[PDB]
C-alpha cells in the first residue's frame, strides 16, 4: 500500500504544517528511468602468489596459470552472454506508458 | 625548506603591494624561501625597484637568497628572498 498523501503537502484547507515538500510535482510521468549501468580476482591472486614464491617461473605454476586464463576466457564469455541477455526493458515499458498515458488535466 | 612563490605586476597597487609584503614578511618569519617574480603590467630597473622596496620593509629580517635575474625572455624579473641566518643577524645587530 502506498503511503497516504492526505494532508501531507502545504495546501489551502490543510491546517497542519506540510509533511512533504516535493521539489517536483507528485504526478506520474509517462516514462520510466533508463536502465543504469573487476572480475575473477581470486584466481589472479592465486597465480600471482605462486609466481611470487616461485620467482615467476610459469613451468611449476602451470595449473594456476591455466586456471587464470580459463577464468579470464569465462569472464569474456559471461560479458557476451550478459550483453545478449540484456538486449521489462525501459523502451517497451515507455511504449506501454505512452499507450496508457497519465492525464493530469481535464478533457 | 618550503618554497613560496609570488607573481606581481609592474603596475601593482600600493595597497596590494603592502598586503603581499605582509605575507612575505610572515613567510620569512616562518623561514621559507620566497621566490618573487615580477612581470610587465616599464623598465627592468624600475621593476627591480619593486624588489628593493619590498626588501626595505625587512631591514634585518630578509635578504636575497638569489639576486634579481631577467627570466622569461627578459619579460619578467625573478628573485629569491630568505631569512637572515643567525650569524648574519648577529652581524647586523653588531652593525
Amino acid at each position: 500500500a502506498t503511503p497516504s498523501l492526505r494532508g501531507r503537502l502545504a495546501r489551502f484547507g490543510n491546517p497542519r504544517k506540510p509533511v512533504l515538500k516535493p521539489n517536483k510535482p507528485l504526478i506520474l510521468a509517462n516514462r520510466v528511468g533508463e536502465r543504469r549501468r573487476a572480475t575473477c580476482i581470486t584466481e589472479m591472486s592465486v597465480m600471482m602468489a605462486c609466481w611470487k614464491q616461485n620467482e615467476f617461473r610459469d613451468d611449476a605454476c602451470r595449473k594456476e596459470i591455466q586456471g587464470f586464463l580459463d577464468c579470464a576466457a569465462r569472464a569474456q564469455e559471461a560479458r557476451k552472454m550478459r550483453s545478449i541477455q540484456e538486449t521489462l526493458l525501459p523502451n517497451k515499458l515507455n511504449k506501454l506508458l505512452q499507450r496508457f498515458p497519465n492525464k493530469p488535466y481535464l478533457s | 625548506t618550503l618554497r613560496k612563490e609570488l607573481i606581481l605586476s609592474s603596475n601593482i597597487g600600493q595597497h596590494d603591494l603592502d598586503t603581499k609584503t605582509k605575507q612575505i614578511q610572515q613567510w620569512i618569519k616562518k623561514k621559507h624561501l620566497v621566490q618573487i617574480t615580477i612581470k610587465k603590467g616599464v623598465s627592468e630597473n624600475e621593476m627591480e625597484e619593486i624588489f628593493h622596496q619590498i626588501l626595505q620593509t625587512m631591514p634585518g629580517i630578509a635578504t636575497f637568497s638569489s639576486r634579481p635575474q631577467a627570466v622569461q625572455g627578459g619579460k619578467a624579473l625573478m628573485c629569491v628572498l630568505r631569512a637572515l641566518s643567525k650569524n648574519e643577524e648577529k652581524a647586523y645587530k653588531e652593525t
Partner: protein, 208 residues
C-alpha cells in the same frame, strides 16, 4: 574497401572441402549450401594450400617487414629457420646419445615453443575510476598475448646492442634462448609479471 560487405573471406583448406558429405552435421551442410551462393574475396597473395604454410611464421614475417619488403622479410625468416636448424643439428651431432633423444631439431617447433614461452599471461592497462588512470593488471586475450610475444622478439632482435650481427643470427640465438626459457625476451615477460604483481593491489580498479 573495394569489397562490398556481401563478400566473405575465402576458406583455403583442402581437408575442409574434401571432408565426406556423410560426416557433415545439418548446420555444416547448411553452411556449405549457403556458401554455394555467397560472393568470396579473392585469395590474398600471402596464404595458399601448401602443406608447409605456417600462419604464425607468416605473421612473424609480416611483423618483421619494413616498408613493404616482403622478399627481404621472408629471406630473413628462412635464414633464421635455417640457422636454428643448423645449430640444433650441430648440437645433436656433438651431443651424446643420452641427450640426443631430447635435443630438438624441428625449427618450426622451436619457434612455436619460443613464442609460447614469451607469451605474457597478464598485462598492464590504464583503467580509470573517478577520473584518474592507473596501470591496473588485467588478463591479456590470446591475440594480444601472441602479438606481444612476437613484437617483443622482433624488438629485442632489432635492438642496437647486437652490432654487426645479422638479423638471422640474432633472431636464431634469441629464439633458442626463449625455447630454453632464458634470454632478454623471457626477462621482459618476467618484468611485466613482476610489475603486475607489484600493482596487484589495484586489481579492483578494473570494472570489466
Amino acid at each position: 574497401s573495394r569489397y562490398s560487405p556481401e563478400f566473405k573471406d575465402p576458406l583455403i583448406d583442402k581437408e575442409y572441402y574434401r571432408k565426406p558429405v556423410e560426416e557433415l552435421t545439418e548446420e555444416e551442410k547448411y553452411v556449405r549450401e549457403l556458401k554455394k551462393t555467397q560472393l568470396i574475396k579473392a585469395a590474398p597473395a600471402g596464404k595458399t594450400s601448401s602443406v608447409f604454410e605456417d600462419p604464425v611464421i607468416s605473421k612473424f614475417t609480416n611483423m618483421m617487414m619494413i616498408g613493404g619488403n616482403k622478399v627481404l622479410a621472408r629471406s630473413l625468416m628462412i635464414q633464421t629457420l635455417e640457422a636454428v636448424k643448423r645449430k640444433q643439428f650441430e648440437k645433436y651431432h656433438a651431443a651424446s646419445a643420452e641427450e640426443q633423444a631430447t635435443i630438438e631439431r624441428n625449427p618450426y617447433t622451436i619457434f612455436h615453443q619460443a613464442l609460447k614461452n614469451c607469451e605474457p599471461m597478464i598485462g598492464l592497462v590504464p583503467i580509470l575510476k573517478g577520473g584518474r588512470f592507473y596501470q591496473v593488471p588485467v588478463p591479456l586475450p590470446d591475440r594480444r598475448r601472441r602479438f606481444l610475444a612476437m613484437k617483443w622478439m622482433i624488438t629485442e632482435c632489432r635492438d642496437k646492442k647486437h652490432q654487426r650481427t645479422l638479423m638471422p643470427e640474432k633472431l636464431s640465438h634469441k629464439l633458442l634462448e626463449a625455447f630454453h626459457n632464458q634470454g632478454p625476451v623471457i626477462k621482459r615477460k618476467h618484468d611485466l609479471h613482476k610489475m603486475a604483481e607489484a600493482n596487484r593491489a589495484l586489481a579492483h580498479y578494473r570494472w570489466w
